[PDB]
Design a protein around this ligand. Structure first.
Ligand code: CL
Ligand code: CL
Ligand code: CL
Ligand code: NA
Length: 129
């Protein structure tokens, strides 16, 4: 599923991401835009053989099991394919674990390089929340 901007913002707000660990909703929408272009089915292979999955491009090296990343962890205790669902619950719940691990949203390269330090509130402007 390819979300609309305000549609995704509302779904993330309902799942408790607004101000989670101090990160306002616009941060999460901005991250999703540049990680996946709002597409739950996005996948991208990393040079180490791991793969990033879903709207927030969660990496199989640490967070999910895809059966093809030897020596990796599954810290969210989920198959990586669950992160491609049109229902973003699994992605949101796993992202809550990632953001709590000590590095905040710097875990998402696109957030650090394209959202951090910008007017992220613009990403939820106009949305009925
Ligand atoms: Cl915001
Ligand atoms: Cl594996
Ligand atoms: Cl933080
Ligand atoms: Na894994």
């Amino acid at each position: 599923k390819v979300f609309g901007r305000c549609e995704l913002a509302a779904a993330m707000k309902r799942h408790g991401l607004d101000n989670y660990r101090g990160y306002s909703l616009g941060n999460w929408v901005c991250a999703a835009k540049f990680e996946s272009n709002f597409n739950t089915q996005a996948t991208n292979r990393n040079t180490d053989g791991s793969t990033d999955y879903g709207i927030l491009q969660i990496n199989s090296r640490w967070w999910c099991n895809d059966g093809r990343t030897p020596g990796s962890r599954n810290l969210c205790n989920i198959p990586c394919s669950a992160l491609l669902s049109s229902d973003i619950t699994a992605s949101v719940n796993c992202a809550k674990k990632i953001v709590s691990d000590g590095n905040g949203m710097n875990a998402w390269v696109a957030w650090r390089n394209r959202c951090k330090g910008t007017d992220v509130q613009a990403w939820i402007r106009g949305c009925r929340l």
